[PDB]
Amino acid sequence: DIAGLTPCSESKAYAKLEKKELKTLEKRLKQYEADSAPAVALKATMERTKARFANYAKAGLLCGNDGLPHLIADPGLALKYGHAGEVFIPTFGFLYVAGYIGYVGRQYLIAVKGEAKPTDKEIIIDVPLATKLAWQGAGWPLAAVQELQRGTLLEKEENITVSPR
Amino acid sequence: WTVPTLNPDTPSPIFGGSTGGLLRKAQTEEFYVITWEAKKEQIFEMPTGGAAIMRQGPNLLKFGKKEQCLALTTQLRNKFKLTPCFYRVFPDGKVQYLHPADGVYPEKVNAGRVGANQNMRRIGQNVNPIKVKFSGRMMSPAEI
Amino acid sequence: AHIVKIYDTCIGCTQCVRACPLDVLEMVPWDGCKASQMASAPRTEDCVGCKRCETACPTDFLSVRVYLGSESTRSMGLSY
Amino acid sequence: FEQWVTDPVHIRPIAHAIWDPHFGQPAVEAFTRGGASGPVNISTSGVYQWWYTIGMRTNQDLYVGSVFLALVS
Amino acid sequence: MKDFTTYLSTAPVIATIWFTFTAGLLIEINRYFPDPLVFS
Amino acid sequence: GMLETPVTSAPIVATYLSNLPAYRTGVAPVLRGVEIGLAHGFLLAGPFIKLGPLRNVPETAEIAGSLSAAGLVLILALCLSIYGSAQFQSARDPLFSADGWSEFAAGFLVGGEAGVAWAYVCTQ
Amino acid sequence: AKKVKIAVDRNPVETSFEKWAKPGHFSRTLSKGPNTTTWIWNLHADAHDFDSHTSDLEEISRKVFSAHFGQLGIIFIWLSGMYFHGARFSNYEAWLSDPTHIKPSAQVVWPIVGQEILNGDVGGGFQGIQITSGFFQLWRASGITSELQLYTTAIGGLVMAAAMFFAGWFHYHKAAPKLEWFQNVESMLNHHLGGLLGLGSLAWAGHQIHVSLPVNKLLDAGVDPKEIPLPHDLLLNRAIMADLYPSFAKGIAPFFTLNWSEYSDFLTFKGGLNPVTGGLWLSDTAHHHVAIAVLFLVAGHMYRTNWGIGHSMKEILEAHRGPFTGEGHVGLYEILTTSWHAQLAINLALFGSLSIIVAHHMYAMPPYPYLATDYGTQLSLFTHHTWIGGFCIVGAGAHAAIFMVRDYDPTNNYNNLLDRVIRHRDAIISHLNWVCIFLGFHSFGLYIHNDTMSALGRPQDMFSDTAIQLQPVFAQWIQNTHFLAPQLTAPNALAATSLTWGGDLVAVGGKVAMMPISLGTSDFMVHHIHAFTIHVTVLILLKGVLFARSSRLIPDKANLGFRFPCDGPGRGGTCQVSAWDHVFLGLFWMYNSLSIVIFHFSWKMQSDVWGTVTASGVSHITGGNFAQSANTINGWLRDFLWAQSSQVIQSYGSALSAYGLIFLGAHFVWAFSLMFLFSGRGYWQELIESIVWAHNKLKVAPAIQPRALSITQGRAVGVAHYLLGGIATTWSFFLARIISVG
Ligand code: CLA
Ligand code: CLA
Ligand code: CLA
Ligand code: CLA
Ligand code: CLA
Ligand SMILES: CC1=C(C/C=C(\C)CCC[C@H](C)CCC[C@H](C)CCCC(C)C)C(=O)c2ccccc2C1=O
């Protein structure tokens, strides 16, 4: 398929890998009773193992000669062949959360700079203010862009201290 | 105020002795002598380690380097409120007096002192190292 | 011998002179500051380079600077 | 070198000989290899392949090069 | 009680609660959606 | 002053040191060199013979060990000579001078090698 | 003649959360709040430095006393958890039935993110992590037979933990003892000798005589644990006890009539190990604690408190005065009743040395049933208590130097033992310096000699048993003397105290519990490595204490304090002159020396003691390769580190896979620490300047100014990570190895 890979659902090594893991679990099972606590736990593990291998094959991943899933990172190859969920979609999932956390913290830091004693508002958090800013961060991409266009996102070069040069 | 003259026969504190005293340097290059007056017999700490009792009246000690003499001077002055002075003594018998150089301790401003190594500029107004290059020796821009 | 320089930003606090553990520095009269006194370095041959004077200077940047230079028995702080 | 050029695939090059008085007899035997007179070190710098490629074929070829470079030095 | 709630607002206490909450959420998600590798 | 102690200041110890060749003044530096060299040279052969690489050979052990002791004395003699060159370039005892030490080093070589040879003769 | 009495102050302090909301309240410097990130570290560094918060000794003592109640309360929570987890998450009941085949386990993990694989197959129809703390063996010896008994102890542990925290609050906020109360050293020793150690030993003897001995006698006989009489039935029914021990038929009359020989059946002096369980006889252990109880109770009546009779500790010290030591022990009593640091320096030194002695004696004389054949527990306990002793000793040097800087006053010390020691410190350090150089050459040089001779094909020139030999003749003589002690010098002892001296091996469940240990050339060489690395650690720590106040380099070091980075680049450079830095360097050498100790123990035991007993004989885990291989550095690298690390690196995919992960993670933390040790904060402060510029550019710069760690904190952070990574690496390597094969 892509880069010589093959779908895991059609991979011989991938299928053999599942048997090896289940065989290991089964070997430990036969030293217990039918419905003892250890036996129930082992059976639960085997169910998750079978579900995991079905899900990855159902997801249409690609397996190498090693018979293990490999991920596609190029946006063009991902959208071309329906691998957007491996890296491409999670890329924009993380950035939204990462910007959320960073934007909320920046809003709080600006908020307390106006207070009389900003330092005491950092070791001792103003929880009522933090919760207020936590909820308003859901729209950070909109607020972040509007700050950039209005020119209030960055400090002026003349207001930033620098070393002699 | 006139430069004091050292009296080699001045009595010394009651001290057993230690291994932290003078070495062969004192016999070849120089050593230092500190003298002071004691109001009453008291126990003080030797910079070389241990405790010594200062006799009432004049006292004299010999040390291996200048910093040891001025370390004892700080103790005597700050804690026991005395006024010591020490010299530099050479093996040839010459004696050089210092601290106080002019009789007044340097912390207190005194008329007659001449400023030394004073630059009438800020640190940020020194020239660049390139401009003092090939001056015959490694020279900092601060020197010129 | 090390090099010790006093710059014209001195405010005559005397802290460098008190800090020095070898009596290298002293205060002299001056007219360039409110205290009317300035630090001086007349005995740099006894300087060891500890830089306790720089630790004690309040001015920013420092008004007393020590440039470590040629070594000797006195500047190397040897008692042997 | 002259033996190596004949069968470079199955001969280990020799760097230089060993004269270590601290060696014991097992050490002397251990480092004797490649049909050498005595203990030797195996070369790893690839000078054999380099020199063989550029046309060197005999020990006298290497001797003349050695004297020439000593003169250039 | 005002001072006690002020103590709970100190940085170490907030971080412990916040990461205890954050860790719990991630642990619980993986308990009900085990082995997530692809968004799908 | 310095910390008095019986080891540093005792009568019996002082007398013993004063009779050693190093501290026995009034003797020519060359003669002191021979006396010192003989003592060290004689002892130097012991460890080489018993624990050398050829210690288990019946007759070669004595020769090899002593021959190595002679070599070490030669190296030590060089150390003595160059020490005098560096130390004395420009006082009570003649030994501590450029002229005295050079004689001292020469005597050590003669005495030391004689001691090594004398040690060998004792064995065979 | 100040009377010994209870003295307190009522309501010294108010119980309020006000100060919980004002960090740094304890110190004047930090009370103003933060301006730079350095304030945060200073808050935690100085929190428990009571002596620097206030100059009042009484206020310092009261904080120490209550801070100790908090430590006791924490141990009870920890102890309660160990007993609780034994009741609810352990296979202890199954283990009692089949101790030789079931692996102890008391921790279970939840089934999340696939970590349930760590619940290994330990036996008894149970899945869990195998434990090496030895709690199962301890519980069996005391007579615990059900999880109910474990559960009740855990509940009692929590009640004690609550009592400890109440006591701390009570004795600080409600009724705080005064300074004169804390200074009754004579009274404290009397109560702690006869009351704490004395009655504690007697009380435990009561438990062993009435609970442990009957229960373990039946357990060894093969009785099912559930069918054994309960401990209270044994206490109430003298008839039952008489069956097990006929001496109980006579009651306590023999004790009061001095017919103590009547109790020979349960107060024995056998010596050796119990063949059935491989541990010390409990009847021997009961007579031990009865004898120890009398010795300490007598010891607790030595000091004079209120009734004339007894000794004054001050008078004893001042009477011991000789010709060689000037004034003598004068002034020590005032030092040791006014300086907490001086007391801590002594107590840490001996408490740490005691922990190391415990490690040696417990392996050689296994005191619990089935402790010896559990090689994982033997290795873990020896290694754990050696590390505890090592850290405590280094602390003793740290707090001896703190006393020297802060609590030392020359006026009280003139020409006494303490003063005279300071006055020849150059003589002491110069001689100890030479001894370390001598020991390093003549111990580690031998290994280099052997490695070079072996590589040159000259095995006959090596130091070994088949070559030039170095026999520990002195140690071998002592082994033989103790082996023959029962014949002539200890006639009433049936056997030697340990099977290490000599004799025959004891095997339990087909495995060796203990057998004679032979000392050869390799043992000679390794022991002199120990003497070398211990002497160097003394040099570093003793040097810091003797030169804490001044030296020929810094004549006024005391004024700089105990913990400062340097006195500048002058005099050639004065980095790491403070006494704190001698502890910092001493920690590395303590770690170096104890690592060899626990490698010596691990290889010697597997090679020469531990193994499986069979018809032909004893086959050891590593097959007796210590004698021939441990005389070269290459032998340690190949035969010990490379070969035995096979278990840990093959652990993935099994219940031991956790040790593999920690083995890598420990390697990481160790290497991470070298970043702090090899660098200086000058580079990092400049790096933060550029990083701060980016935050300023985005209006996201913090109000608390970022600062690179201080010079001292860089060294403290470095050594802490260095120790954690190094020690955790050995910890994973030992457990994954011994659990897999042992
Ligand atoms: C990190 C750099 C990088 C690199 C090395 C590649 C590499 C590749 N991309 Mg990807 N791509 C990237 C980032 C990158 N991409 C980004 C950030 C995006 C936008 C989110 C895309 C969007 C994208 C699309 C839409 C397509 C590719 C495709 C390709 C392949 C051939 C064309 C190409 O991009 O040539 C080298 C790459 C560059 C010079 C960098 C810019 C590439 C642009 C954005 C895409 C060019 C597409 C091209 C005109 C398609 C023509 C038809 C093709 C069959 C020949 C190649 C494997 C094509 C593919 O699937 O081929 C099988 C394709 O259709 N890429
Ligand atoms: C709820 C009860 C209570 C309250 C309101 C107070 C209030 C006060 N106490 Mg008191 N105290 C209490 C209980 C209480 N105490 C108890 C139970 C003890 C016995 C230990 C003490 C012992 C004690 C001492 C010795 C001192 C005080 C002091 C103080 C004052 C400041 C305390 C502070 O800043 O704490 C904030 C501190 C903390 C929240 C730290 C808590 C530490 C505990 C021990 C938990 C340790 C956990 C441990 C580190 C866990 C391992 C960590 C690891 C997993 C990372 C204040 C008047 C100090 C004072 O008056 O100074 C002038 C003082 O010196 N208290
Ligand atoms: C501290 C350790 C300790 C303790 C607590 C005990 C306890 C006991 N031993 Mg043991 N014992 C010990 C050490 C100990 N022993 C040692 C070291 C040895 C070796 C020499 C022995 C050897 C030994 C033997 C040989 C025997 C015992 C026996 C006993 C039991 C009866 C003793 C007796 O006759 O007491 C007599 C009387 C008293 C002890 C006084 C009791 C005072 C009570 C508690 C006062 C209560 C007052 C209160 C106000 C009333 C309640 C009011 C309220 C309800 C309202 C008893 C359970 C005997 C037994 O029965 O064994 C099974 C027995 O035969 N012991
Ligand atoms: C009975 C034991 C004991 C006691 C009561 C004390 C008490 C004291 N020591 Mg001493 N000390 C001890 C043992 C002890 N020490 C030992 C064994 C050592 C050798 C390591 C030292 C070395 C030592 C030094 C070098 C210093 C002290 C200092 C002090 C004082 C302040 C401590 C402080 O504020 O800590 C505050 C506590 C902390 C900042 C927490 C430290 C956390 C460590 C580094 C964690 C290590 C890893 C962890 C245990 C496990 C992994 C954790 C996980 C989260 C990854 C205080 C009087 C200091 C002082 O100024 O004394 C006058 C000082 O400079 N001690
Ligand atoms: C493997 C690393 C290593 C080595 C070899 C040493 C070696 C030494 N350290 Mg050091 N040290 C190390 C790591 C090391 N350290 C580390 C990582 C730290 C930081 C924590 C320190 C911190 C430290 C301190 C603080 C101290 C030492 C001390 C010592 C000395 C111990 C006594 C002695 O002289 O032994 C004998 C010397 C050796 C064993 C070195 C090897 C000798 C070889 C095998 C034989 C000789 C070779 C022979 C002559 C042939 C040469 C041929 C050639 C000339 C051609 C010694 C020089 C202590 C000291 O100085 O005590 C006096 C001391 O105080 N070290
Ligand atoms: C790396 C390094 C630093 C830099 C390291 C620093 C500044 C410490 C960093 C500590 C943490 C990571 C920063 C503070 C984190 C806050 C508490 C906020 C965390 C919020 C959540 C993510 C928990 C030094 O300062 C240093 C000083 C002296 C010698 C060597 C070194 C050295 O090697």
From Swiss-Prot, chain A:
Q: Name one GO cellular component term.
A: chloroplast thylakoid lumen
Where in the cell? Answer: Plastid, Chloroplast thylakoid lumen
Superkingdom of the source?
Answer: Eukaryota
Q: Where is the signal peptide?
A: none
- Which terms are listed as keywords in the entry? Chloroplast, Photosynthesis, Photosystem I, Plastid, Thylakoid, Transit peptide
Primary place of residence? plastid
Function (record text)? Probably participates in efficiency of electron transfer from plastocyanin to P700 (or cytochrome c553 in algae and cyanobacteria). This plastocyanin-docking protein contributes to the specific association of plastocyanin to PSI.
| Similarity section | Belongs to the PsaF family.
The protein, known as: Photosystem I reaction center subunit III, chloroplastic
Name the species this protein comes from.
Answer: Chlamydomonas reinhardtii
What are the top taxonomic ranks of the organism?
A: Eukaryota, Viridiplantae, Chlorophyta, core chlorophytes, Chlorophyceae
Which gene does this sequence derive from?
Answer: PSAF
From Swiss-Prot, chain B:
> What is the protein name given in its UniProt record?
Photosystem I reaction center subunit II, chloroplastic
Which Gene Ontology cellular component terms are annotated? Answer: chloroplast thylakoid membrane; photosystem I reaction center
The record gives the membrane topology as: Peripheral membrane protein
State where the protein is found: Plastid, Chloroplast thylakoid membrane
Q: Which UniProt keywords apply?
A: Chloroplast, Membrane, Photosynthesis, Photosystem I, Plastid, Thylakoid, Transit peptide
Q: What protein family is recorded? A: Belongs to the PsaD family.
Q: Which GO terms describe its biological process?
A: photosynthesis
Role noted for this protein:
PsaD can form complexes with ferredoxin and ferredoxin-oxidoreductase in photosystem I (PS I) reaction center. PSAD may encode the ferredoxin-docking protein.
Curated annotation (Swiss-Prot), chain C:
Cofactor comment text: Binds 2 [4Fe-4S] clusters. Cluster 2 is most probably the spectroscopically characterized electron acceptor FA and cluster 1 is most probably FB.
- Cite the GO molecular-function annotations of the record: 4 iron, 4 sulfur cluster binding; electron transfer activity; metal ion binding; oxidoreductase activity
Q: Which residues form the 4Fe-4S ferredoxin-type domain?
A: 1-30, 38-67
| Positions of [4Fe-4S] cluster 2 binding | 20, 47, 50, 53
Q: Which reaction does it catalyse?
A: reduced [plastocyanin] + hnu + oxidized [2Fe-2S]-[ferredoxin] = oxidized [plastocyanin] + reduced [2Fe-2S]-[ferredoxin]
- Pfam families in the cross-refs: Fer4_7
One GO CC annotation: chloroplast thylakoid membrane
User: Where does the protein principally reside?
Assistant: plastid
> EC annotation?
1.97.1.12
Where does it live in the cell?
Plastid, Chloroplast thylakoid membrane
Enzyme superclass (EC): oxidoreductase
Which domain of life, per UniProt? Eukaryota
| Biological process according to GO | photosynthesis; photosynthetic electron transport in photosystem I
Q: Which cofactor does it need?
A: [4Fe-4S] cluster
The record lists [4Fe-4S] cluster 1 as bound by: 10, 13, 16, 57
Q: Which UniProt keywords apply?
A: 4Fe-4S, Chloroplast, Electron transport, Iron, Iron-sulfur, Membrane, Metal-binding, Oxidoreductase, Photosynthesis, Photosystem I, Plastid, Repeat, Thylakoid, Transport
Q: How does it sit in the membrane?
A: Peripheral membrane protein
Q: What is the effect of changing residue 34 to T?
A: Drastically decreases affinity of PSI for ferredoxin. Decreases cross-linking of ferredoxin to PSI-D and PSI-E
Q: How does it assemble?
A: The eukaryotic PSI reaction center is composed of at least 11 subunits.
Q: Which HAMAP family match?
A: PSI_PsaC
Q: What is this protein called?
A: Photosystem I iron-sulfur center
Q: Tell me the organism.
A: Chlamydomonas reinhardtii (Chlamydomonas smithii)
This protein's gene is called: psaC
From Swiss-Prot, chain D:
Coiled-coil stretches noted in the UniProt entry, renumbered to this chain: none
Domain of life of the organism in this record? Eukaryota
Its subcellular locations are: Plastid, Chloroplast thylakoid membrane
Q: Which family does it belong to?
A: Belongs to the PsaA/PsaB family.
* Role according to the record: PsaA and PsaB bind P700, the primary electron donor of photosystem I (PSI), as well as the electron acceptors A0, A1 and FX. PSI is a plastocyanin/cytochrome c6-ferredoxin oxidoreductase, converting photonic excitation into a charge separation, which transfers an electron from the donor P700 chlorophyll pair to the spectroscopically characterized acceptors A0, A1, FX, FA and FB in turn. Oxidized P700 is reduced on the lumenal side of the thylakoid membrane by plastocyanin or cytochrome c6. Both potential cofactor branches in PSI seem to be active; however, electron transfer seems to proceed preferentially down the path including the phylloquinone bound by PsaA.
Subunit composition and interactions = The PsaA/B heterodimer binds the P700 chlorophyll special pair and subsequent electron acceptors. PSI consists of a core antenna complex that captures photons, and an electron transfer chain that converts photonic excitation into a charge separation. The eukaryotic PSI reaction center is composed of at least 11 subunits.
Q: What is this protein called?
A: Photosystem I P700 chlorophyll a apoprotein A2
Source species, please? Chlamydomonas reinhardtii (Chlamydomonas smithii)
**Source gene?**
psaB
Q: Which residues of the full protein are shown?
A: 75 to 147 of 735
